[PDB]
Write a protein that binds this ligand. Structure first.
Ligand SMILES: *[C@@H]1O[C@H](CO)[C@@H](O[C@@H]2O[C@H](CO)[C@@H](O)[C@H](O)[C@H]2NC(C)=O)[C@H](O)[C@H]1NC(C)=O
Ligand SMILES: *[C@@H]1O[C@H](CO)[C@@H](O)[C@H](O)[C@H]1NC(C)=O
Lengths: 129, 232, 227
């Protein structure tokens, strides 16, 4: 209740919260706190959509490209309504999987000579077809 | 003279889309006096094609009969009987095959166990096991692969399903594959593919290698830059 | 009138610790007129504890013959025969059995595999595997233990021997036991005991714990560049 969520990334599992604590009583001596929580996977591979990819042992977390806003907002100017660009900075790699997303693959299946490629489910359960 | 009747399998339905019935007959001395036919409960005739195999070393002959039936015929549970007639048999042999009812659907679970640590020290071979448990009914199809290349039907073995003593109604089976010690030490990948009706997409796969699954050490590197950037 | 005289397997020998022979004869009109008596090479009479089973629904009855003999005499190559006399049978029926000699012998190897990490993450159950391979012939008797005491045979399952496609003349088998994840996480120990006739002492054991497979090094490095 006393914390405000800024970003809730799922691919990098990054979550940032900010909070002001009323330390002492002088209004000019209150500290501003920034919390970062990162969960890293140790079993996932380089490309989450290809099981043959090698393992990944290097993780990079840029905070300038995480707390960024990229959706035009509406602004009232007393004579019209316009769309405004939040940031000008606006291929990112997905470290972990997303529950709200489904991951599938193509695999050759041989039986009596004939080969039937069928869609698989890399994720354990995720969504249903 | 014994007759073996094999009901259609789920894999044959999925990958061929044509239900077939087979009642293999062995221990036959003469192939010119054999006849394989299928009759329905009401007596309607079913077209059956009879094939004659080669000569077995034990002075026996086998006849193979493949016939096309509708998926409904089998799935409806309609009881079918294969008719075999021979001059040496005073009475024709009858076999009863049907699919039981009152069976629910349970999603199976798949796990791979890496080769034992004290097996690699002998530097002879490695064994990988694919354990699938918690499913009903008891028809499964497990196929092994190596980095997208289907493996030969001879390098791996599979066992018939058996009941689970703990929870009745859920079964299990496993597939064992052997590999060269140097091949596994190189770092090649292997996959376990299982086909069953209970799965949402009806096929699942899992992947193991040397680096994943009971490893020796964990090497991680982390970089956190731009920690004082603009957030707003 | 069918007479079957099956010899006991290695499992019965290693479980009952005594050599017990059976000359069970089924489909008998009147079991009151039955007599079971084995014979050694010398043809002496055998003290047989004849038993009568229940009444089959098809108006048939069976007689069971139990005899205890010193095991040291079977492996030497002595043929034992049981004689059964019935009123409906004009002549007695004799079944002569012995031990097949000349069978190739190889040492089985025992491998125990711990439960999978992903299964334990679900916090539901754990399973263990006792793989025995490279052995001949097909006579293996495997149990389980927990802290020096045996468990019921309703909590583990064993499989029949199956030929190994790779090396001709070699067999393999597997046993699967179920363990509650919480118990497993307490820190108990489990033991797999394999009994085969080719092993020098006939008994071999393996043990697995929770700490099996724990990693040795956790190299981790962190960089904080406030650029
Ligand atoms: C990671 O894996 C995916 C899936 O294989 C790669 O994208 C696929 O590329 C193939 C052709 O090579 C297409 O048939 C698929 O449609 C692509 N997938 C999707 C979702 O569009 C992707 O290129 C891989 N990434 C890297 C870096 O290799
Ligand atoms: C630890 O990291 C260094 C590089 O920082 C690397 O040289 C070394 O191999 C790592 N340790 C292990 C056990 O991989």
């Amino acid at each position: 209740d006393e914390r405000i969520v800024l970003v809730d990334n799922k691919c990098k599992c990054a979550r940032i919260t900010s909070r002001i604590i009323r330390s002492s009583e002088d209004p000019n001596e209150d500290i501003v706190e920034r919390n970062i929580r990162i969960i890293v996977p140790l079993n996932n591979r380089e490309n989450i959509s290809d099981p043959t990819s090698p393992l990944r042992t290097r993780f990079v977390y840029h905070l300038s490209d995480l707390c960024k806003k990229c959706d035009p907002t509406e602004v009232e100017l007393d004579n019209q309504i316009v769309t405004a660009t939040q940031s000008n900075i606006c291929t990112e790699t997905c470290y972990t999987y997303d529950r709200n997303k489904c991951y599938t693959a193509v695999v050759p299946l041989v039986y009596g000579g004939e080969t039937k490629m069928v869609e698989t489910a890399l994720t354990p359960d995720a969504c249903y077809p | 003279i014994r007759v073996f009747a094999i009901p259609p399998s789920f894999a044959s339905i999925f990958l061929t889309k044509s239900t077939k019935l087979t009642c293999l007959v062995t221990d036959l001395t003469t192939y010119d006096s054999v006849t394989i036919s299928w009759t329905r409960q009401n007596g309607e005739a079913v077209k059956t094609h009879t094939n004659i195999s080669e000569s077995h070393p034990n002075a026996t002959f086998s006849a193979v009969g493949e016939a096309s039936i509708c998926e409904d015929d089998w799935n409806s549970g309609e009881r079918f009987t294969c008719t075999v007639t021979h001059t040496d048999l005073p009475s024709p042999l009858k076999q009863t095959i049907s699919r039981p009812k009152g069976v629910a659907l349970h999603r199976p679970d798949v796990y791979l166990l890496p080769p034992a640590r004290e097996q690699l020290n002998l530097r002879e071979s490695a064994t990988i096991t694919c354990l699938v448990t918690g499913f009903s009914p008891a028809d499964v199809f497990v196929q092994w692969m190596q980095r997208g290349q289907p493996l030969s039907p001879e390098k791996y073995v599979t066992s018939a399903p058996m009941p689970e003593p703990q929870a009745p109604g859920r079964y299990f089976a496993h597939s064992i594959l052997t590999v060269s010690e140097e091949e596994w030490n190189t770092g090649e990948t292997y996959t376990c593919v299982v086909a069953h009706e209970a799965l949402p997409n009806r096929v699942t796969e899992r992947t193991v290698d040397k680096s994943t699954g009971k490893p020796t050490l964990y090497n991680v590197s982390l970089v956190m830059s731009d920690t004082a950037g603009t957030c707003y």
